[PDB]
């Protein structure tokens, strides 16, 4: 392969959210095989961002996933050529985000070029009023469709005062190379904002992913 | 009230693509280890022109294994019971709306089911009976209006390896005040164990185990 | 056979959010003009603890005015009749599924309906009864697998400003093969003309005229 | 009355659709109060387009709409300043298009810059296989939410062979100064391409758009 116990990360994101443009860069590091990582991010244009930073966070790389050896790792196999992805996030109040990202490797550094579009967030809703506290942790199902890997998740944001604001995630990941394809399976995720200034110009972001099958054993044969 | 072993009885009235049917079933389970089995029989509208897989999840979370650190909304619902209302949206516009009332009498739960399936395309894998099974899934649960809401991104393995996808939303409604749990998951696995040629006779199995995320929070301490 | 003046007979079994109900109605209409009137009484379930507005459209495109040049899928389907099957997906994820069989017994039509509504948030505008009226609407109808699909963007005007949105998708079913209409529209307006604050008793009027577009083509 | 019977139009488009970038520019003329315009288009970069061009055409201005007297033009009254809109197009085949447009006025000539993002269109798809003939005439319904003008349409593309590729359109319209909003109403739409060259790099486009309330008069008025 070419991936190691420790890898560095470089992110570049541009986007637009409800007519507001912004760019954000980051530099981070993680452990592909243990499926954890941390990223330091800076808002370069558009500060102070007037929407919850949480809608961005999952946009900011499934090579940092712990993949048992019994499950082909689509992502690690995709390198050095790499892989890209595309995502739709539809919120329950009809806010919506579409997102594209290219994932290359130079040396030990993965670079992430991300474009991020968000739209239709009601001016008095949790996103533009920043009432989000965090994403509940989540489980993503991964299936093949046209040889692409496609993943879906029912996500929820924990709001100030408990209870949740939901959004459905659809992601399509595409290798730039012939790779052994996995069976149907899952990824347990927890994403976290560790630390941030009050306005979010700097944010330290963290992510744990573990792949599996189901743990309920089949009655079949 | 809820004993290590219990019986189950089901009555379902349905209509799928303007075709009515009725199904009766009887079985048993271990509410606390969240396993159970069911014998089903078509008492009307035999033989069914469409895949039995759409019916199976309609035919009680009482049978879920809950850790003692998650409140069991369901068990708590009893003696009195709880009802549930569910949407199933298929990727090709096929829709079922489903409702079930769950009362207890003796050692045997009784489930009264209304199941309306509409709008399946004639040449889709539903009417052409081209599905094989549900992949096991992970449902996520939350409180909203004092009821409990489950969402699941479902998928049918087709004949030829592909998947036919379906989203699930169930609102569960205890008929008394109970102790509401924190946001959690239930992992599932449903399987048809045996069937006669017509699926006029069906032997169903379900395993449901509740949990939090396996992944540690890293933020603060 | 479908004569200028007809009688309508209406029976509806329903469950919304668990509360079961039966509603019966009878009236008359001018099918070839698009109007009809209906006197409804609630036989079971009263008082209904939810917006009556959800029910009113499930209570016949036979009473649409159709022109010469647009096939009338509905009057054509008689004397044998048709059924239909409808999905209503409301913006707060309240959803309804309806079926109604439309039959003829001489001068009176007998529409027999199954209504099912569920997941209405207990505090939403349907269970709290905060809806004044359906707006007037326009349904696009097209062919897909030999049968006739309608879609309509619906909206209920709400107690003091605000609109609550609903998508309607109906699929219609001929009890004969009929002539298949080209893509086209049917403008709608329905209204409760009177009621008892509980809606035990209601008067109900529908209008509607099938048309093509009122804009001309520049295609050559 | 800053706006004339006759106005010119500038139109500038960049976008993606399944991973294929493009930049489209057009010049045209039209009549605001009659509801009619025309438009000539060069595919500036990205030619030949690898997708159907109809998916673009509704993004290449509701000024060019005949608004009767008793419904205030939300769109013409928006100026001098200008306006924007956000739009989703959710195709039945799950291809999604998310669109933001920015509409100005200098001299006699309105400027349109469009951000076209296109996603998830199948490879045996109508939009990728270029199988579309035109949009069927339409009726949009338009309402107030959050003091923004929202519109919903049930659109349908006719396809070689007859038959139809459906798409649900919601567009939310955003004036940059505080106009008086109309009540509930409808626009009838007809959009037509008047001619194209084989790969469609060159195109003239014509839309006609009339506002109205429901013709039907009120029984209870």
Short mmCIF file of C-alpha atoms in Angstrom, two decimals, chain B:
data_model
loop_
_atom_site.label_atom_id
_atom_site.label_comp_id
_atom_site.label_asym_id
_atom_site.label_seq_id
_atom_site.Cartn_x
_atom_site.Cartn_y
_atom_site.Cartn_z
CA UNK B 1 -45.82 -9.15 34.18
CA UNK B 2 -43.17 -9.81 31.52
CA UNK B 3 -41.78 -13.26 31.94
CA UNK B 4 -38.55 -14.74 30.67
CA UNK B 5 -40.63 -16.58 28.05
CA UNK B 6 -43.83 -15.32 26.41
CA UNK B 7 -46.26 -16.04 23.62
CA UNK B 8 -47.23 -13.93 20.69
CA UNK B 9 -50.30 -13.64 18.48
CA UNK B 10 -50.63 -11.54 15.38
CA UNK B 11 -53.49 -10.45 13.21
CA UNK B 12 -52.71 -8.47 10.09
CA UNK B 13 -55.15 -6.98 7.57
CA UNK B 14 -53.42 -5.65 4.42
CA UNK B 15 -53.74 -4.22 0.95
CA UNK B 16 -50.76 -4.15 -1.47
CA UNK B 17 -51.36 -2.85 -4.98
CA UNK B 18 -55.13 -3.04 -4.60
CA UNK B 19 -54.98 -6.67 -3.53
CA UNK B 20 -56.23 -7.45 -0.04
CA UNK B 21 -55.04 -10.16 2.26
CA UNK B 22 -55.25 -11.29 5.85
CA UNK B 23 -52.57 -13.13 7.85
CA UNK B 24 -52.67 -14.79 11.25
CA UNK B 25 -49.62 -15.84 13.28
CA UNK B 26 -48.62 -17.37 16.58
CA UNK B 27 -45.28 -17.77 18.18
CA UNK B 28 -43.13 -17.15 21.17
CA UNK B 29 -40.03 -15.31 22.37
CA UNK B 30 -37.67 -14.29 25.16
CA UNK B 31 -38.46 -10.71 25.65
CA UNK B 32 -35.30 -10.00 27.58
CA UNK B 33 -32.89 -11.68 25.22
CA UNK B 34 -34.71 -9.99 22.39
CA UNK B 35 -35.25 -13.14 20.21
CA UNK B 36 -38.48 -14.55 18.88
CA UNK B 37 -40.06 -16.79 16.26
CA UNK B 38 -43.33 -16.68 14.37
CA UNK B 39 -45.51 -18.97 12.29
CA UNK B 40 -47.60 -17.11 9.76
CA UNK B 41 -50.53 -18.14 7.66
CA UNK B 42 -52.42 -16.38 4.85
CA UNK B 43 -56.11 -16.73 5.71
CA UNK B 44 -57.21 -14.54 2.86
CA UNK B 45 -56.04 -13.20 -0.46
CA UNK B 46 -53.84 -16.25 -0.97
CA UNK B 47 -51.54 -16.52 -2.85
CA UNK B 48 -49.69 -13.15 -2.50
CA UNK B 49 -48.58 -11.69 -5.86
CA UNK B 50 -45.67 -9.73 -4.26
CA UNK B 51 -42.49 -10.33 -2.18
CA UNK B 52 -43.17 -11.42 1.45
CA UNK B 53 -40.12 -9.45 2.58
CA UNK B 54 -42.22 -6.22 2.63
CA UNK B 55 -44.47 -7.72 5.35
CA UNK B 56 -41.98 -9.24 7.82
CA UNK B 57 -40.93 -6.21 9.94
CA UNK B 58 -44.64 -5.30 10.40
CA UNK B 59 -45.16 -8.56 12.08
CA UNK B 60 -42.87 -5.67 18.66
CA UNK B 61 -39.71 -4.23 20.32
CA UNK B 62 -40.74 -5.64 23.63
CA UNK B 63 -38.53 -8.27 22.09
CA UNK B 64 -35.32 -6.36 22.23
CA UNK B 65 -32.42 -6.94 24.61
CA UNK B 66 -31.96 -3.66 26.57
CA UNK B 67 -29.02 -3.08 28.87
CA UNK B 68 -30.09 -2.03 32.35
CA UNK B 69 -28.58 1.37 31.68
CA UNK B 70 -31.07 1.96 28.88
CA UNK B 71 -34.70 2.50 29.84
CA UNK B 72 -36.94 -0.01 28.03
CA UNK B 73 -39.70 2.10 26.77
CA UNK B 74 -41.56 -0.98 25.63
CA UNK B 75 -41.59 -3.36 28.51
CA UNK B 76 -42.55 -0.32 30.68
CA UNK B 77 -45.56 0.27 28.46
CA UNK B 78 -47.16 -2.84 30.16
CA UNK B 79 -49.63 -3.89 31.61
CA UNK B 80 -51.47 -1.42 29.37
CA UNK B 81 -49.48 -1.60 26.04
CA UNK B 82 -48.33 0.74 23.25
CA UNK B 83 -49.14 1.24 19.53
CA UNK B 84 -46.92 2.15 16.56
CA UNK B 85 -47.15 3.97 13.27
CA UNK B 86 -44.60 3.44 10.52
CA UNK B 87 -43.73 4.65 7.12
CA UNK B 88 -41.72 2.55 4.70
CA UNK B 89 -40.43 4.52 1.71
CA UNK B 90 -38.89 2.42 -1.06
CA UNK B 91 -36.27 3.91 -3.40
CA UNK B 92 -38.62 3.36 -6.37
CA UNK B 93 -41.68 5.14 -4.80
CA UNK B 94 -43.23 2.05 -3.34
CA UNK B 95 -44.83 3.06 -0.02
CA UNK B 96 -46.36 1.17 2.86
CA UNK B 97 -48.00 2.76 5.81
CA UNK B 98 -48.35 0.51 8.77
CA UNK B 99 -49.90 0.65 12.27
CA UNK B 100 -49.87 -1.84 15.09
CA UNK B 101 -51.58 -2.10 18.45
CA UNK B 102 -49.92 -4.22 21.12
CA UNK B 103 -51.94 -5.48 24.06
CA UNK B 104 -51.07 -8.09 26.61
CA UNK B 105 -53.41 -10.81 27.91
CA UNK B 106 -52.06 -13.75 29.80
CA UNK B 107 -48.58 -14.77 28.83
CA UNK B 108 -49.21 -13.81 25.20
CA UNK B 109 -48.85 -10.54 23.39
CA UNK B 110 -51.46 -9.81 20.81
CA UNK B 111 -50.59 -7.61 17.84
CA UNK B 112 -53.30 -6.12 15.68
CA UNK B 113 -51.78 -4.90 12.38
CA UNK B 114 -53.05 -2.65 9.55
CA UNK B 115 -50.63 -2.73 6.55
CA UNK B 116 -51.24 -0.62 3.46
CA UNK B 117 -48.67 -1.07 0.66
CA UNK B 118 -49.24 1.20 -2.36
CA UNK B 119 -47.67 2.08 -5.64
CA UNK B 120 -45.16 -0.63 -6.29
CA UNK B 121 -44.14 -0.60 -9.91
CA UNK B 122 -45.39 -3.71 -11.73
CA UNK B 123 -41.91 -4.67 -12.95
CA UNK B 124 -40.12 -3.73 -9.76
CA UNK B 125 -38.42 -6.34 -7.53
CA UNK B 126 -41.39 -6.26 -5.22
CA UNK B 127 -44.12 -7.36 -7.68
CA UNK B 128 -41.58 -9.58 -9.56
CA UNK B 129 -40.52 -11.27 -6.24
CA UNK B 130 -36.82 -10.61 -6.82
CA UNK B 131 -35.74 -9.77 -3.22
CA UNK B 132 -34.01 -12.39 -1.04
CA UNK B 133 -33.84 -10.82 2.45
CA UNK B 134 -33.32 -7.77 4.52
CA UNK B 135 -29.65 -7.03 5.42
CA UNK B 136 -29.47 -6.63 9.20
CA UNK B 137 -29.77 -3.01 10.25
CA UNK B 138 -29.22 -0.40 13.02
CA UNK B 139 -32.23 1.79 14.14
CA UNK B 140 -31.67 4.94 16.09
CA UNK B 141 -34.11 6.10 18.64
CA UNK B 142 -35.13 9.43 20.03
CA UNK B 143 -37.72 11.20 22.05
CA UNK B 144 -39.94 13.79 20.31
CA UNK B 145 -43.27 14.96 21.81
CA UNK B 146 -42.86 12.32 24.62
CA UNK B 147 -43.21 9.45 22.13
CA UNK B 148 -40.14 7.46 20.97
CA UNK B 149 -39.07 7.66 17.24
CA UNK B 150 -36.95 4.92 15.41
CA UNK B 151 -35.33 5.56 11.94
CA UNK B 152 -33.44 2.85 9.88
CA UNK B 153 -31.87 2.96 6.44
CA UNK B 154 -33.00 -0.53 5.25
CA UNK B 155 -31.93 -2.58 2.32
CA UNK B 156 -33.09 -5.70 0.45
CA UNK B 157 -30.40 -8.02 -1.03
CA UNK B 158 -31.68 -8.71 -4.56
CA UNK B 159 -31.27 -11.65 -6.79
CA UNK B 160 -27.90 -10.78 -8.40
CA UNK B 161 -26.20 -9.01 -5.48
CA UNK B 162 -27.72 -5.54 -5.83
CA UNK B 163 -29.79 -3.78 -3.14
CA UNK B 164 -33.23 -2.23 -3.05
CA UNK B 165 -33.31 0.45 -0.43
CA UNK B 166 -36.10 1.62 1.94
CA UNK B 167 -36.23 4.08 4.74
CA UNK B 168 -38.12 3.33 7.93
CA UNK B 169 -39.64 5.66 10.44
CA UNK B 170 -41.67 4.24 13.33
CA UNK B 171 -43.21 6.35 16.04
CA UNK B 172 -43.85 4.17 19.14
CA UNK B 173 -46.62 5.31 21.56
CA UNK B 174 -46.93 3.92 25.09
CA UNK B 175 -50.47 4.08 26.39
CA UNK B 176 -49.15 5.28 29.77
CA UNK B 177 -46.34 7.42 31.22
CA UNK B 178 -43.00 5.56 31.33
CA UNK B 179 -39.37 6.48 31.82
CA UNK B 180 -37.91 7.80 28.56
CA UNK B 181 -34.41 6.64 27.50
CA UNK B 182 -31.47 8.55 26.09
CA UNK B 183 -30.81 8.60 22.32
CA UNK B 184 -29.70 5.02 21.42
CA UNK B 185 -29.56 2.31 18.81
CA UNK B 186 -31.00 -1.14 18.37
CA UNK B 187 -29.20 -3.52 16.09
CA UNK B 188 -31.56 -5.90 14.15
CA UNK B 189 -31.60 -9.09 12.17
CA UNK B 190 -34.76 -10.51 10.63
CA UNK B 191 -34.91 -13.76 8.78
CA UNK B 192 -37.50 -15.95 7.18
CA UNK B 193 -36.42 -19.47 8.45
CA UNK B 194 -38.92 -21.55 6.35
CA UNK B 195 -41.77 -21.02 3.83
CA UNK B 196 -44.25 -23.03 1.63
CA UNK B 197 -44.10 -22.23 -2.13
CA UNK B 198 -46.77 -19.56 -1.95
CA UNK B 199 -45.50 -18.01 1.36
CA UNK B 200 -49.04 -18.96 2.45
CA UNK B 201 -47.06 -20.56 5.32
CA UNK B 202 -44.13 -18.64 6.85
CA UNK B 203 -41.72 -19.17 9.82
CA UNK B 204 -40.10 -15.82 10.88
CA UNK B 205 -37.27 -14.98 13.25
CA UNK B 206 -36.17 -11.67 14.85
CA UNK B 207 -33.19 -10.61 17.02
CA UNK B 208 -33.11 -7.01 18.45
CA UNK B 209 -30.37 -5.75 20.90
CA UNK B 210 -30.27 -2.18 22.20
CA UNK B 211 -27.12 -0.17 22.89
CA UNK B 212 -25.26 3.03 22.97
CA UNK B 213 -22.37 3.73 20.56
CA UNK B 214 -19.30 1.56 21.12
CA UNK B 215 -17.06 4.57 20.76
CA UNK B 216 -15.72 6.68 23.61
CA UNK B 217 -16.36 10.35 23.83
CA UNK B 218 -12.94 12.12 23.50
CA UNK B 219 -14.06 15.65 24.30
CA UNK B 220 -13.29 16.88 27.81
CA UNK B 221 -13.52 14.83 30.94
#
